[PDB]
Amino acid sequence: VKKFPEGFLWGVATASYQIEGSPLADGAGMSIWHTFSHTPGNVKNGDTGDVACDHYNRWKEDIEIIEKLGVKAYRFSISWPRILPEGTGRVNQKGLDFYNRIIDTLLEKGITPFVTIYHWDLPFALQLKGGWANREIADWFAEYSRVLFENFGDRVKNWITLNEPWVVAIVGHLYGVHAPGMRDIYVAFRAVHNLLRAHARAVKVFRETVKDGKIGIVFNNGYFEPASEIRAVRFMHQFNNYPLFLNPIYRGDYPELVLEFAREYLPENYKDDMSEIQEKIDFVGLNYYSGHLVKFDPDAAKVSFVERDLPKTAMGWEIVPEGIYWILKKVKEEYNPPEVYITENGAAFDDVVSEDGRVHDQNRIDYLKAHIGQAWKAIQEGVPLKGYFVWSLLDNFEWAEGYSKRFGIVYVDYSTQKRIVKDSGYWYSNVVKNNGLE
């Protein structure tokens, strides 16, 4: 037996652009993911979020799936351009209506909503004004967040400002692999800094508007091990993991090795913003998927990855369950946040529907079991983990990989939009019902 604390929150997670489709329905503005995916060469197979899982129409069915599995929490995100089509100013009631219905339905069914305010679908109108590169986005984001709090804060009490701000800044503005598809290191570090400022403004407004909820922020994390008997592992953790952001929030500056690498790229007077960035948060959400062997490498960031002969997912990600334990221990050790959630953990496998009508994803059961087991351990050793969210409820649009990578515990047949609960979803429901592993 590995039984979790009473009231531990078992969840599933999605994001608006990955599942919804109908990006321009009911007066919604374009997002940067709409324009990025409609640009040839950016996304595998020319795939876009035009239809995705058609959750925009099938939302009731999908929630009924969450209910039927007995899953206790649903992490989903709100499309900023459905709410404010030009990013600021005008509010679109039909956009609010869409999320109102989802929210009321969840509550009616006893499911706890966790709302991600920003999961990467920036209004295109704001991107024309520089998007995350423009300091003014702290204001635009604060106004957007205020609208959400005023409309939904009576019912939704668990909020996340940003999903994976490292990805948004670095994959979006340095690697150019995600919207808005830029490759400029100075822009990417200004986006890091402005993501922090916007995050802190939204928390500040949250305290003024929703005096009963909790708000936090979500980071991607890798488990970095050194290829030999070091500092490159230190750098990768500080740069790619929660410290890039938590060091400002908790300690009022960027991590030491980040400054060593990136000081020239930050605004000259960036410290002027740090006391505001220290706005108190209620919880930290950590996403975790993979471990990486890392070694120093002259002329790289001075770091390269070393391939290991370990089980991998369809992403090529090495399966390293101990990583989730490590990152949970490490966050308590470094910043001691009052609550932590695992806001995403999951895997992509080449799922197939058998002749029996089933999806026998034993590889995904094995992945989830092992990571839940390591999360359990962290809890036994004092980490205040309050919940765990499987990425994802549904197979969906996996960004620049398009539909070619399936992360769901529910299979989606894209030709018919049929949902087929996978073995891993059945398995997970039993875990939730039991409040743990057996």
Ligand X SMILES: OC[C@H]1NNC[C@@H](O)[C@@H]1O
Question: Is the Cβ of residue 98 or residue 120 nearer to ligand X in the bound state?
Answer: 120
Residue 124 interacts with which of ligand X, Ca ion, none, CB < 5 to 8 Å by class: none
Residue 222 token pair:
């890798």
In this structure, what DSSP letter does residue 168 have?
I
For the chain, first and last CA: distance in Å?
Answer: 5
Residue 251 token pair:
């300690």
| Number of separate helices (H) and strands (E) present in the chain | 17, 15
Question: Is the Cβ of residue 84 or residue 390 nearer to ligand X in the bound state?
Answer: 390
Site for ligand X, residues 397 to 436, rule: CB under 6 A: 398, 407
Residue 23 token pair:
């990006």
Residues contacting residue 368 through CB under 8 Å, at least 6 positions apart: 345, 346, 347, 390, 424, 427, 428
Stated as kind and residue range, the H or E segment containing 287 is strand 283-287
Residue 50 interacts with which of Ca ion, ligand X, none, CB < 5 to 8 Å by class: Ca ion
Task: Give the per-residue contact string, 3-42, with Ca ion (x = CB under 5 A; - = no).
Answer: ----------------------------------------
In sign, the C-alpha dihedral spanning 259, 172, 164, 216 is positive
Instruction: Find the shortest distance in angstroms from Cβ 371 to ligand X.
Output: 14
Site for Ca ion, residues 145 to 184, rule: CB under 5 A: none
Instruction: Find the shortest distance in angstroms from Cβ 274 to ligand X.
Output: 27
Q: Is 287 in the site for ligand X (CB under 6 A)?
A: yes
Instruction: Locate breaks in the chain with C to N over 2.5 A; list the residue preceding each.
Output: 229, 300
Q: Is 319 in the site for ligand X (CB under 6 A)?
A: no
Question: Is the Cβ of residue 50 or residue 401 nearer to Ca ion in the bound state?
Answer: 50
* Residue position matching structure tokens 């928390």: 203
Q: Is 344 in the site for ligand X (CB under 6 A)?
A: yes
Instruction: Find the shortest distance in angstroms from Cβ 18 to ligand X.
Output: 6
Residue 276 interacts with which of Ca ion, ligand X, none, CB < 5 to 8 Å by class: none
Instruction: Give CA 31 to chain center in angstroms.
Output: 17
Stated as kind and residue range, the H or E segment containing 9 is strand 9-13
Instruction: Find the shortest distance in angstroms from Cβ 246 to ligand X.
Output: 18
Q: Based on the number of CB atoms within 10 Å of its own CB, is 298 exposed (0-12), middle (13-18) or buried (19 or more)? A: exposed
268 in active site: no
Question: Is the Cβ of residue 38 or residue 271 nearer to Ca ion in the bound state?
Answer: 38
Residue 245 interacts with which of ligand X, Ca ion, none, CB < 5 to 8 Å by class: none
Site for Ca ion, residues 42 to 81, rule: CB under 5 A: 50
Q: How far apart are CA 10 and CA 429, in angstroms?
A: 9
Among 15, 66, 84, 233, binds ligand X (CB under 6 A): 15
Question: Is the Cβ of residue 287 or residue 429 nearer to ligand X in the bound state?
Answer: 287
Q: Which is catalytic among the residues 20, 334, 344, 398?
A: 344
Instruction: Find the shortest distance in angstroms from Cβ 386 to Ca ion.
Output: 39
Instruction: Give CA 122 to chain center in angstroms.
Output: 15
Question: Is the Cβ of residue 27 or residue 46 nearer to Ca ion in the bound state?
Answer: 46
Q: How far apart are CA 349 and CA 312, in angstroms?
A: 9
Task: Give the per-residue contact string, 163-192, with ligand X (x = CB under 6 A; - = no).
Answer: -x----------------------------
194, 188 in Cβ contact below 8 A? Answer: no
Residue 344 interacts with which of ligand X, Ca ion, none, CB < 5 to 8 Å by class: ligand X
Instruction: Find the shortest distance in angstroms from Cβ 261 to ligand X.
Output: 24
* Cis peptide preceding 22, ω within 30 of 0: no
Instruction: Find the shortest distance in angstroms from Cβ 28 to Ca ion.
Output: 13
Residue 391 interacts with which of ligand X, Ca ion, none, CB < 5 to 8 Å by class: ligand X
Q: Is 391 in the site for ligand X (CB under 6 A)?
A: yes
Question: Is the Cβ of residue 261 or residue 407 nearer to ligand X in the bound state?
Answer: 407
Q: How far apart are CA 287 and CA 294, in angstroms?
A: 20
Q: How many other CB atoms are there within 10 angstroms of residue 275's CB atom?
A: 10
Calculate Rg over the CA atoms of the chain.
Answer: 20
215, 189 in Cβ contact below 8 A? Answer: no
Q: How far apart are CA 218 and CA 234, in angstroms?
A: 21
Question: Is the Cβ of residue 41 or residue 316 nearer to Ca ion in the bound state?
Answer: 41
Q: Which is catalytic among the residues 20, 164, 279, 318?
A: 164
Count of residues in the chain: 438
How big is the site for Ca ion, counted in residues (CB under 5 A)? 1
Instruction: Find the shortest distance in angstroms from Cβ 332 to ligand X.
Output: 22
Residue 326 interacts with which of ligand X, Ca ion, none, CB < 5 to 8 Å by class: none
164 in active site: yes
Which residues bind to ligand X, rule: CB under 6 A? 15, 164, 287, 344, 391, 398, 407
Which residues bind to Ca ion, rule: CB under 5 A? 50
Residues with catalytic roles: 164, 344
